[PDB]
């Protein structure tokens, strides 16, 4: 498959539900959830390598990284992490994440490009899984 595209957002679950989970308070998550009801998604993919930069209406951030090659970013909720992207089948990828310092929940993210041309982007803290859905621009 190929992932590179510019994909807007058609649909976004679950992702309060996630942010209780990292302590963000009610006032802060409701901005958040409608901040990610904005946002957007840009992807070069060169064979196993990724360029992904995501941003709202007031942030943007870019992720760079080859599959199964650790690289560093930050968890959903801003702290640093080491993260390691494996192929879970041809067209769905899984990130597990590990903290720098401290500790927290378990938290990772996957990314899939459907059958019928959706990218599924879904972000995990403990038991608690956000979903969201992007179409191409």
């Known amino acids: 498959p190929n992932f590179s595209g510019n994909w807007k ?13 990292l302590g963000v308070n009610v006032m802060l998550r409701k901005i958040a959830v409608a901040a990610a009801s904005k946002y957007a998604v840009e992807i070069k993919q060169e064979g196993d390598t990724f360029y ?3 941003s709202t209406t ?5 992720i ?4 199964g090659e650790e690289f560093e970013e930050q ?6 992490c080491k993260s390691l992207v494996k192929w879970e089948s041809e067209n769905k990828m899984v990130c597990e994440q590990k903290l720098l310092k401290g500790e927290g929940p378990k938290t990772s993210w996957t990314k899939e490009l459907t059958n019928d041309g959706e990218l599924i982007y879904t972000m995990t803290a403990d038991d608690v899984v956000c979903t969201q859905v992007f179409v191409r621009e």
């Open 9 to 21: 957002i058609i649909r976004s679950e679950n992702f309060e539900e996630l942010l209780k989970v």
């Open 52 to 54: 992904i930069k995501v």
């Open 58 to 62: 007031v942030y943007t951030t870019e």
């Open 64 to 67: 760079n990284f080859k599959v």
């Open 75 to 80: 968890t959903v909720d801003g702290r640093p």
